[PDB]
Amino acid sequence: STGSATTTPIDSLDDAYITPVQIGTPAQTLNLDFDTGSSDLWVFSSETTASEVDGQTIYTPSKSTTAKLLSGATWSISYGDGSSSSGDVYTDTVSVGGLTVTGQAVESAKKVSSSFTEDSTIDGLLGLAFSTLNTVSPTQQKTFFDNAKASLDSPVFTADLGYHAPGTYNFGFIDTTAYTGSITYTAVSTKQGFWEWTSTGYAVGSGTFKSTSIDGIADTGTTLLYLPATVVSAYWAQVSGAKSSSSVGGYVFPCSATLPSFTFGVGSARIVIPGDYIDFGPISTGSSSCFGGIQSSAGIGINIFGDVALKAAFVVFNGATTPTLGFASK
Numbered sequence: 666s667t668g669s670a671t672t673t674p675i676d677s678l679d680d681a682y683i684t685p686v687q688i689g690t691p692a693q694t695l696n697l698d699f700d701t702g703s704s705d706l707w708v709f710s711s712e713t714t715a716s717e718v719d720g721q722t723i724y725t726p727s728k729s730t731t732a733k734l735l736s737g738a739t740w741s742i743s744y745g746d747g748s749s750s751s752g753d754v755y756t757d758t759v760s761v762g763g764l765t766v767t768g769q770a771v772e773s774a775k776k777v778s779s780s781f782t783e784d785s786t787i788d789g790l791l792g793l794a795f796s797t798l799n800t801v802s803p804t805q806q807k808t809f810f811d812n813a814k815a816s817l818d819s820p821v822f823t824a825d826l827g828y829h830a831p832g833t834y835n836f837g838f839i840d841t842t843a844y845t846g847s848i849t850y851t852a853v854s855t856k857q858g859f860w861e862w863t864s865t866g867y868a869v870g871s872g873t874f875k876s877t878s879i880d881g882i883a884d885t886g887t888t889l890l891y892l893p894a895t896v897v898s899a900y901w902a903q904v905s906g907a908k909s910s911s912s913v914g915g916y917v918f919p920c921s922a923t924l925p926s927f928t929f930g931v932g933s934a935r936i937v938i939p940g941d942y943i944d945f946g947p948i949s950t951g952s953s954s955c956f957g958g959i960q961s962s963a964g965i966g967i968n969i970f971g972d973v974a975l976k977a978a979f980v981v982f983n984g985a986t987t988p989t990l991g992f993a994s995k
């Protein structure tokens with residue numbers, strides 16, 4: 666089997682992407698944030714504290730003839746950005762782009778943190794990291810991909826995120842019309858439960874390529890590109906007036922600037938992030954200080970190839986017995 670679904674930016678900055686997902690019988694369609702950096706499929710629901718729901722579409726398990734309470738199961742997750750959610754668990758039928766999994770753990774939120782409430786466009790998350798990170802207790806549950814894998818034509822999914830435009834998540838096949846040149850594959854460590862890999866280096870603008878190993882995660886659920894302080898300083902040094910602002914929470918730059926591109930290495934191949942992709946706009950409405958899309962990972966403990974990097978590529982998440990990651994230009 667295969668599936669194919671369009672993913673759409675939630676706003677004009679590409680802060681995140683939402684993909685429609687059918688849950689239950691009859692189908693209830695929710696717009697979920699597909700997140701290769703976590704492993705829980707959780708939704709706003711009829712059980713979510715009412716004051717914490719503000720415009721989201723909710724899943725109502727009592728209206729699904731295929732929903733079953735997973736007795737005794739609870740979940741609770743905290744994300745790298747400080748947000749969180751928790752609740753109980755149903756199993757139900759879940760379909761993405763024509764691909765159906767029966768008995769998928771659908772984690773129903775009883776509580777969500779303010780950042781989730783405040784984002785009316787995201788109805789929940791669909792985790793696509795390794796199932797070892799799933800938070801359901803006392804019986805850990807499998808991701809949608811993990812459940813679908815054996816049925817797929819090929820044990821893969823691909824992310825093709827757009828810049829200020831829709832893109833595609835495919836399951837079970839590689840669309841050879843969606844990229845240019847060849848796909849370069851690179852090794853993955855699953856030891857921390859992430860799609861963790863090692864970039865071979867970087868360049869800033871038209872500058873020379875620096876060969877250096879940068880370990881990090883391919884994370885569709887993180888907006889920005891978080892890299893070591895040395896690398897990030899070298900980038901922003903090429904933008905007149907750019908500076909790190911402790912009050913704002915990262916590098917900012919004059920909105921009048923033209924940003925240089927940023928290149929990252931995948932083996933001997935190179936992915937070029939255009940300068941425009943690194944502009945996240947005014948820090949507050951009307952400001953002439955703009956927020957940068959490349960930021961230091963120093964406070965985080967891990968480097969993160971988030972949407973800024975991934976949307977410059979066609980990315981293959983290869984879930985074969987030994988997982989790997991593939992990147993192509995597009």
Ligand SMILES: O=C(NCC(F)(F)F)c1ccon1
Binds near residue numbers: 704798887
């Ligand atoms: O925050 C999470 N993932 C995104 C991160 F890697 F950037 F942190 C998370 C929470 C539970 O499992 N993973």
